[PDB]
Amino acid sequence: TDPRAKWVPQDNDIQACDYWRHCSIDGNICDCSGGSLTNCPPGTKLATASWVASCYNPTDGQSYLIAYRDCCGYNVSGRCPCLNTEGELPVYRPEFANDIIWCFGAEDDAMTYHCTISPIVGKASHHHH
Amino acid sequence: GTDPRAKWVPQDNDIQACDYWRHCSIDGNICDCSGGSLTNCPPGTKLATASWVASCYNPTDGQSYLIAYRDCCGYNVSGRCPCLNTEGELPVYRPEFANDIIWCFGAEDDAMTYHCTISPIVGKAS
Amino acid sequence: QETQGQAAARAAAADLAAGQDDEPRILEAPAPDARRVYVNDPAHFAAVTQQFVIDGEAGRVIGMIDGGFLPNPVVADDGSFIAHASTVFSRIARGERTDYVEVFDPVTLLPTADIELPDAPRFLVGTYPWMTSLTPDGKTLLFYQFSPAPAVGVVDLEGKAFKRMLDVPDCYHIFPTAPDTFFMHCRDGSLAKVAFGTEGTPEITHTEVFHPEDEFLINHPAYSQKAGRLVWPTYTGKIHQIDLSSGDAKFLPAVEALTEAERADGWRPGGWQQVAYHRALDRIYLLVDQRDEWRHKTASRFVVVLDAKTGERLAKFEMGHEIDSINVSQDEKPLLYALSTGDKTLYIHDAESGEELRSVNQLGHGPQVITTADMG
Amino acid sequence: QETQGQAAARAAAADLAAGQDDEPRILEAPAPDARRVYVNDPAHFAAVTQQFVIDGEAGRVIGMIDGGFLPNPVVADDGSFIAHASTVFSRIARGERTDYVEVFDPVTLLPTADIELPDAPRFLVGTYPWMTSLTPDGKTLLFYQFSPAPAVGVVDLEGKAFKRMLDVPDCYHIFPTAPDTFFMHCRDGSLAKVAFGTEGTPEITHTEVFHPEDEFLINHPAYSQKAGRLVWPTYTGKIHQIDLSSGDAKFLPAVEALTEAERADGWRPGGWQQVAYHRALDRIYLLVDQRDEWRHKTASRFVVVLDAKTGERLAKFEMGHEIDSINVSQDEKPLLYALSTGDKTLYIHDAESGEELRSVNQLGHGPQVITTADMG
Amino acid sequence: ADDALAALGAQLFVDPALSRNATQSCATCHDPARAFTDPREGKAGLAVSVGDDGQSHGDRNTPTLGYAALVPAFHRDANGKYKGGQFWDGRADDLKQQAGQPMLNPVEMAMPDRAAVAARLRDDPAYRTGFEALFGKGVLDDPERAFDAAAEALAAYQATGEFSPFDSKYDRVMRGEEKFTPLEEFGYTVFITWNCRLCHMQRKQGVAERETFTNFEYHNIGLPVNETAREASGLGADHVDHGLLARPGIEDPAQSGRFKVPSLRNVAVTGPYMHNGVFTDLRTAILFYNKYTSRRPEAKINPETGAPWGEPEVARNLSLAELQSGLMLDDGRVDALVAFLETLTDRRYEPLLEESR
Amino acid sequence: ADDALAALGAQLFVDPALSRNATQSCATCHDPARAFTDPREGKAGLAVSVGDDGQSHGDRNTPTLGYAALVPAFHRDANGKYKGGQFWDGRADDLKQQAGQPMLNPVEMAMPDRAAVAARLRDDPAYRTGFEALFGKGVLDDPERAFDAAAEALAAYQATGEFSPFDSKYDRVMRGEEKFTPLEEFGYTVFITWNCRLCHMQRKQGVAERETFTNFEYHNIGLPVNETAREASGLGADHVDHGLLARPGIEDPAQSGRFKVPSLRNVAVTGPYMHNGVFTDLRTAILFYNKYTSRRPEAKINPETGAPWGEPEVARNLSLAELQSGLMLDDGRVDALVAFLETLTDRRYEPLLE
Ligand code: HEC
Ligand code: HEC
Ligand code: HEC
Ligand code: HEC
Ligand SMILES: [Ca+2]
Ligand SMILES: [Ca+2]
Ligand code: NA
Ligand code: NA
Ligand code: NA
Ligand code: NA
């Protein structure tokens, strides 16, 4: 609730903006519009592109790579909006950038932004973060 | 603040407030808030020829006037100065007094999207 | 106790610790059921709008459907599909208008039909559920047109095509009673029965006049298609009930939602969907509050529940929030849904005790319409 | 201190009293001028969006323009037109995509061109003003494409036609310097100069790498076409300035916006449009506050003003609201515009004293981008 | 002075000695018992009037003089919209310019010239007395002076309360002396919310002090030629009534086919309707408007003939933006408008309303 | 025990007495000095290998045996995707069922039968002792038990830590023992944010305990025929390699042209690449994926030939959803990927990177 303070990850509620995996989420948590933490809501199309971040998990004290993937082809959900930017780099480092609509690869060429999932794709490990 | 259920109290001192006396049966957004004026449409929008009326009491002169609202059409809803008043407003089957209807008919280019409403006087009440 | 987001965090934590795998994919919404509820957000006349598909039992958003300008949602009562008539333009709110009907699968939410409506014939109005309506067999959708004159559009959902416009008298709303028949309310104070074929003048019959020109019938009557019960409050909480189950209109005795002392003390209905009807309980629910007589679209904070047969008051709940619309689940121990357009929140109450049970917030910009299927 | 709505109630009462007639009509916006400001609402990724045209002097909305999904606005510095690259879909957010450019008359707000962009070539991203750009002569519009690879699309506004895509290397943003030339910022730390004839590969030459792999340059540099000054803050408030006024890139002395002390106490730029540049005053404005290193997109409450030539701080303003974006008018005694995404409100300040003068609220759902024409 | 001038006009108005064969006065075609319109049957029914020669028919329907004194003199506003004037095509500037024209029109009163008119005025000792008192001695001996003085007298007489009494039920209702019937009130509400008020109210907005239900502008509503009246007038099968474009000095081809919006005061009693008298019934004149709005086949059929309304006499410059309102008047709303328009009848003509209703 | 069994497999693995003319062992083609692949230059270069007879070439590139013991036994998973097994077309269930096949394959080791294999096993006193101690007395007198026990020993030998040491730079970096170079970490970041991780990672999400950079699935990536290798194989210019559909029991037409996702471990040193060895350079193999994504003229051209890639040998069941990612790998990212793949080299093959 102080927006400029260091972000304090928690591991007890995925719908809140301070959930540890949402460390570089930009948009809306899919779990608030009929998705789940790592699945898209009905009617949306799951992109194959992602932006990645290394997110600290307060629970096991380990750092996980989160490869955010967008659920596309619906107007933005309006529910549980969140913008965090841990390790987030500018657009010219697109692998870590999150203003970009990462809807590439989505079925039916769906490119509109509805919400984002936060699946873990590895441990590791970044120089910038 | 301000009881939505209280009897409405017209004022003749600020056309951007929902209690301005001509807005007694407005539904939507005051055009004056998106670049129109009390009785003109904003640039880019199209002026309907249809209207719903109401008899609105003017506390400046003690007279009731007929206000024939007309929509400004062909733009998404302005989203500025929303207001809904229903003084004398009757259900949809008495459409000349019914204000949920998008009164955009007659607008140029067949515009039927609702942007805002103007509040011109067209008569004295009777 | 434990929120959905908290239960989710715990389960993900446990999958992570167990090395449990799982494919990121597109969810299916859970099977439609009686505690499913749909909230449509006309978004105060915005050009694009949202419907939220909600599990009433968990208080959970299970899906969403996009729509265009003031769409009309319908929900098939047996749960097999949902649909809306909707309006888009080539350049957001400007240019070529396309009106169309979409039918959706209720689990995947994917459109299974997209039916163009010729010549942009939809009535653009703040959303009245009974301005677009499914026939009881779910095969036809009927939609009201106002301009250039009152008319009703017939859309074949099974064959996925627009059929025809029907000329009607100076009447409003559409309460289908049969695959080929619906009722409308007319400016003269009667109901019109309209029976239509594929071609030919509809057979239009008027009932008797059932109300004086100065009793005003609200834009949001409750109608239970399966009961054929039309429940139509006036501005004063006088309730007309019309029984359409015979196929013809039978006028039921009028009841008063408010007592004479309440009325003398300024109690009146008000809101949007002011009235709900529970078919199995034969119970009417009315949004009421103390208000001036021309404040009839403002929120209300009380629901009176009265027996539809006797008019006896069973409860007066203090909702505790500013409620514009109500509806009920049609199962037994029903839920009472109380949507606040101001709060953008659906409050989910126990219809028997009036207790708030849970709520779903962040439902668009100005959500106004609640729909449930009557699946029982 | 009489408000615009009060002044308007008074003129209306007087017309009524004098029996003065007037024709209800479509107004024209007042002539574009230096105090006109445009606020774009990307609406937090909503499928349709709005631009607000504001008379900054009066603090009055004087017009609006609708747009589709994350459109890129542009404003001809001379005030003779505005334009955007926009994106619509045939069913709100789904179905066939059309990317297109509209050019608008700046007083009627009517579209004067509508130019289809083939094969949906726009970069869909939270709005960066320099991802779509007018050439100085206003005859061409260039837009960035990311997929399948970095590219730049050339749109002829004069013949109202798309021309072709330019291959570029791994670079970003588009800063036109001439009818046939623009720069981009590359991954490798260089700037690329792109010179396109009418035919074939453009001629692409690189500058020196001008920053380390670990010095992060923000997505919203300020760029003055008329001065050829590219002002590029990095994440620590360090400011790159590149002079493009000769046709080729000369690097100005790098400058620091926060004091070496201040950075030690957690001062960093943050927001959206973190930086403004006033051409006649040669002056950089920067949204800074005390924050963690990875809270770079959060609102800021302070603006610092520094001289472009030396880096001397000139003022530090306490904005009194959570500001996400700033910009300035380009006339004498400029306004400093401070847009709060959170408040949906453009606060209009005196750029000399930093005092709040007036503000325009209800600027959509998440307004982010301020644009002004440089007309002097 | 103001009394006397009007009283002299009252006298000329009813005087047939101002017509060649002495058979015709203003009052013959502008009959005070019929709201100053012509009750006489000609070769085209009541569409057009017959002149003093007993044979010549005009090409336009004789309009009421009631409330004609409320119309502004002809001018172009800053809109570039022409307003005001007299005659259906606005070609007279004002009442005074108009009054001499029937006198010399070979199709109407047919006096050969101003001198013949002057010689008639001199023949009557009351005119020598009345004219000389208002205009000076020997006025009647100067044909230009006599003619201009007669036109002034006649304009002044049309400006009296006699022509514009404002004592219709509408007026009485707007004074709070009575209420409209519920049909009438509904007719009023339709009138003021539908497209009729875009042309048949004085003002675009605000309240008129003396409403006469016209904005005095010129519109081409796309009326067909009245065939019988056009044959009676003898102007030719190829003749086109250009309306306002026929006013001399108007060159703008955009004005072709535009006619001055008539005051709707006394409309119920001054049928037939439109500039060529083409429609007999008030209801038909209202129904004509549905042709631009209704999708029903009946909307294109003139209920008086059972045939299409007809091609517009002038197919261009139609007021489509106003006419094509997107809403059709159902029968309940047409009856409501008839009832409303009937409240516009001056008190003294209320008895005429019997044989309309 | 599980040890002696493996040590027996160790002996069989380098014994050419298991080939007809006693000229080749498993190690001939799966050369431990070359990450268990074939160094020997042939008619089609290194694309396919030559059998015991000195002339018969195979139609498929000899794959590494490193990490093959991590592949699950062939099965169809609950979403209907076939996974696991051995050979490029999954036609063997597991390493045990695979081991006897090269022995009897006339194009490879070319023993006439299980009996002739048993005969060669008996000629060696040391096999008599080793087999008998593990499977019991007379095991070698019975051709069926002899052959099955030999396959068993080989499979166990392939399951030892020697074939799967997880000592690559990648493994060390995941242990936090070392860091990736900037280029390598870019490659890693690209590999897991771009399409590659859709096929070349063990799991959809979470962290694998022993990552081998394959999900074990079957995908038709739309490869052309290897002209010279197909010629050398003698299978005929008409022939179509149907991939997984050639496994007996698979009848599904949708599997035609599909091949097992190879493990990318040691990929830097087991060129040429793909099931038919068509690309000699790693860089080419990576570049092939741009044919699906990039608009540029160069994307349609094999940089090794300077000619178009070729029509797919099987023009259907392409994994378009995964391959048409919408994004093109520029030179920099292809560089980063080569750098990342090289980190998947086992410690003992680091010297081969040169
Ligand atoms: C029948 C032969 C007529 C006699 C005698 C007079 N008038 Fe007339 N009037 C007549 C017609 C056919 C018309 C319309 C002609 C046209 O070209 O539009 C008129 C019109 C007028 C008007 C204009 C009214 C209006 O435009 O609303 C006036 C003021 C008028 N008439 C007055 C008038 C006077 C004063 C007469 C005696 C001198 C007189 N009219 C004679 C038909 C006939
Ligand atoms: C301007 C575009 C108009 C609108 C909208 C309406 N009317 Fe009209 N009306 C108009 C003109 C220009 C004329 C004269 C046309 C001609 O060339 O003759 C009229 C005429 C009438 C009449 C006949 C009156 C008479 O002959 O004295 C009636 C009864 C009438 N108009 C009524 C009317 C109603 C009820 C309307 C809303 C449906 C309406 N008009 C619209 C100009 C215009
Ligand atoms: C060259 C003549 C070879 C000899 C001798 C052996 N193998 Fe082999 N191996 C070879 C090829 C051409 C292939 C692929 C053939 C195909 O149809 O796909 C193989 C494959 C294997 C595998 C599967 C590895 C994987 O699928 O990733 C295994 C486990 C294997 N080979 C083991 C093996 C053993 C144990 C051998 C001696 C008995 C042996 N091979 C000999 C080429 C040649
Ligand atoms: C599933 C659709 C895949 C995607 C996406 C990627 N790869 Fe792949 N790869 C896949 C298969 C099925 C195969 C073998 C194909 C065949 O028929 O031969 C491969 C092969 C490789 C190779 C060759 C390795 C070898 O031992 O020969 C390399 C170097 C490779 N793949 C790398 C790679 C990269 C870097 C990718 C993202 C750009 C990538 N692959 C995508 C399956 C799929
Ligand atoms: Ca007439
Ligand atoms: Ca190989
Ligand atoms: Na006729
Ligand atoms: Na003329
Ligand atoms: Na080859
Ligand atoms: Na098979």
Coordinates of N, CA, C and O in Angstrom, one line a residue, chain F residues 143-195:
Chain F
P143 N 20.1 -69.9 -26.7 CA 20.1 -68.6 -27.4 C 19.2 -67.5 -26.9 O 19.6 -66.3 -26.9
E144 N 18.0 -67.8 -26.5 CA 17.0 -66.8 -26.0 C 17.4 -66.1 -24.7 O 17.3 -64.9 -24.6
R145 N 17.8 -66.9 -23.8 CA 18.2 -66.4 -22.5 C 19.6 -65.6 -22.7 O 19.8 -64.5 -22.1
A146 N 20.4 -66.1 -23.6 CA 21.8 -65.5 -23.9 C 21.6 -64.1 -24.4 O 22.2 -63.2 -23.9
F147 N 20.8 -64.0 -25.4 CA 20.5 -62.7 -26.1 C 19.8 -61.7 -25.2 O 20.2 -60.6 -25.1
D148 N 18.7 -62.2 -24.5 CA 18.0 -61.3 -23.6 C 19.0 -60.8 -22.5 O 18.9 -59.7 -22.0
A149 N 19.9 -61.7 -22.0 CA 20.8 -61.4 -20.9 C 21.8 -60.3 -21.4 O 22.2 -59.3 -20.7
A150 N 22.3 -60.5 -22.6 CA 23.2 -59.6 -23.3 C 22.6 -58.2 -23.4 O 23.2 -57.1 -23.1
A151 N 21.3 -58.1 -23.7 CA 20.5 -56.9 -23.9 C 20.4 -56.2 -22.6 O 20.6 -55.0 -22.4
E152 N 20.0 -57.0 -21.6 CA 19.9 -56.6 -20.2 C 21.3 -56.0 -19.8 O 21.3 -54.9 -19.3
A153 N 22.4 -56.7 -20.0 CA 23.7 -56.1 -19.6 C 24.0 -54.8 -20.3 O 24.4 -53.9 -19.6
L154 N 23.8 -54.8 -21.6 CA 24.0 -53.5 -22.3 C 23.1 -52.3 -21.8 O 23.6 -51.2 -21.6
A155 N 21.8 -52.6 -21.5 CA 20.9 -51.6 -21.0 C 21.4 -51.2 -19.6 O 21.5 -50.0 -19.4
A156 N 21.9 -52.1 -18.8 CA 22.4 -51.7 -17.5 C 23.6 -50.9 -17.6 O 23.8 -49.9 -16.9
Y157 N 24.5 -51.3 -18.6 CA 25.7 -50.5 -18.8 C 25.3 -49.1 -19.2 O 25.9 -48.1 -18.7
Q158 N 24.3 -49.0 -20.1 CA 23.9 -47.6 -20.5 C 23.2 -46.8 -19.4 O 23.0 -45.5 -19.6
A159 N 22.8 -47.4 -18.3 CA 22.2 -46.7 -17.2 C 23.2 -46.3 -16.2 O 22.8 -45.6 -15.2
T160 N 24.4 -46.5 -16.4 CA 25.4 -46.1 -15.4 C 25.7 -44.6 -15.5 O 25.4 -44.0 -16.5
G161 N 26.3 -44.1 -14.4 CA 26.6 -42.7 -14.3 C 27.5 -42.3 -15.5 O 27.5 -41.1 -15.8
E162 N 28.3 -43.2 -16.0 CA 29.1 -42.9 -17.2 C 28.4 -42.3 -18.4 O 29.0 -41.5 -19.1
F163 N 27.2 -42.8 -18.7 CA 26.5 -42.3 -19.9 C 25.8 -41.0 -19.6 O 25.4 -40.3 -20.5
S164 N 25.6 -40.7 -18.3 CA 24.7 -39.6 -17.9 C 25.4 -38.9 -16.7 O 24.9 -38.9 -15.6
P165 N 26.5 -38.2 -17.0 CA 27.2 -37.8 -15.7 C 26.6 -36.5 -15.1 O 27.0 -36.1 -14.0
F166 N 25.8 -35.7 -15.9 CA 25.4 -34.4 -15.5 C 26.5 -33.6 -14.9 O 26.4 -33.0 -13.9
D167 N 27.6 -33.5 -15.7 CA 28.7 -32.7 -15.3 C 29.0 -31.6 -16.3 O 30.1 -31.0 -16.3
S168 N 27.9 -31.2 -17.1 CA 28.1 -30.1 -18.0 C 28.2 -28.8 -17.3 O 27.9 -28.7 -16.1
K169 N 28.6 -27.8 -18.1 CA 28.7 -26.4 -17.5 C 27.3 -26.1 -17.0 O 27.1 -25.5 -15.9
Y170 N 26.3 -26.4 -17.9 CA 24.9 -26.1 -17.5 C 24.6 -26.7 -16.1 O 24.1 -26.0 -15.2
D171 N 25.0 -28.0 -15.8 CA 24.8 -28.6 -14.5 C 25.5 -27.9 -13.4 O 24.8 -27.7 -12.3
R172 N 26.7 -27.6 -13.6 CA 27.5 -26.8 -12.6 C 26.9 -25.5 -12.3 O 26.8 -25.1 -11.1
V173 N 26.4 -24.7 -13.3 CA 25.7 -23.5 -13.1 C 24.4 -23.6 -12.3 O 24.1 -22.8 -11.5
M174 N 23.6 -24.7 -12.6 CA 22.4 -25.0 -11.9 C 22.7 -25.4 -10.4 O 21.8 -25.1 -9.5
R175 N 23.9 -25.9 -10.2 CA 24.3 -26.1 -8.8 C 24.9 -24.9 -8.1 O 25.2 -24.9 -7.0
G176 N 24.8 -23.7 -8.8 CA 25.4 -22.5 -8.3 C 26.9 -22.5 -8.1 O 27.5 -21.7 -7.5
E177 N 27.5 -23.5 -8.7 CA 29.0 -23.7 -8.7 C 29.8 -22.8 -9.6 O 30.9 -22.5 -9.4
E178 N 29.1 -22.3 -10.7 CA 29.7 -21.4 -11.7 C 28.6 -20.5 -12.2 O 27.4 -20.8 -12.0
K179 N 29.0 -19.4 -12.9 CA 28.0 -18.7 -13.7 C 28.1 -18.9 -15.2 O 29.2 -19.2 -15.7
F180 N 27.0 -18.8 -15.9 CA 27.0 -18.6 -17.4 C 27.7 -17.3 -17.8 O 27.5 -16.3 -17.1
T181 N 28.4 -17.3 -18.9 CA 28.8 -16.0 -19.5 C 27.5 -15.2 -19.9 O 26.4 -15.7 -20.1
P182 N 27.7 -13.9 -20.1 CA 26.6 -13.1 -20.6 C 26.0 -13.8 -21.8 O 24.7 -13.9 -21.9
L183 N 26.7 -14.1 -22.8 CA 26.2 -14.8 -24.0 C 25.4 -16.1 -23.7 O 24.3 -16.2 -24.1
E184 N 26.0 -16.9 -22.8 CA 25.4 -18.2 -22.5 C 24.1 -18.0 -21.7 O 23.1 -18.6 -22.0
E185 N 24.0 -17.0 -20.9 CA 22.8 -16.7 -20.1 C 21.7 -16.1 -21.0 O 20.5 -16.4 -20.9
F186 N 22.1 -15.3 -22.0 CA 21.2 -14.8 -23.0 C 20.6 -16.0 -23.7 O 19.4 -16.2 -23.8
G187 N 21.5 -16.9 -24.2 CA 21.0 -18.1 -24.8 C 20.0 -18.9 -24.0 O 19.0 -19.4 -24.5
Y188 N 20.3 -19.2 -22.7 CA 19.4 -19.8 -21.8 C 18.1 -19.1 -21.7 O 17.1 -19.7 -21.8
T189 N 18.1 -17.8 -21.4 CA 16.9 -17.0 -21.4 C 16.2 -17.1 -22.7 O 14.9 -17.3 -22.6
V190 N 16.8 -17.1 -23.8 CA 16.1 -17.3 -25.1 C 15.5 -18.7 -25.2 O 14.3 -18.8 -25.6
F191 N 16.3 -19.7 -25.0 CA 15.9 -21.0 -25.1 C 14.6 -21.2 -24.2 O 13.7 -21.9 -24.7
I192 N 14.5 -20.7 -23.0 CA 13.3 -20.9 -22.3 C 12.2 -19.8 -22.4 O 11.2 -20.0 -21.7
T193 N 12.3 -18.8 -23.2 CA 11.2 -17.8 -23.4 C 10.7 -18.0 -24.8 O 9.6 -17.7 -25.1
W194 N 11.5 -18.6 -25.7 CA 11.1 -18.8 -27.1 C 10.6 -20.2 -27.2 O 10.6 -20.9 -26.2
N195 N 10.1 -20.5 -28.4 CA 9.5 -21.9 -28.5 C 10.3 -23.1 -28.1 O 9.7 -24.1 -27.6

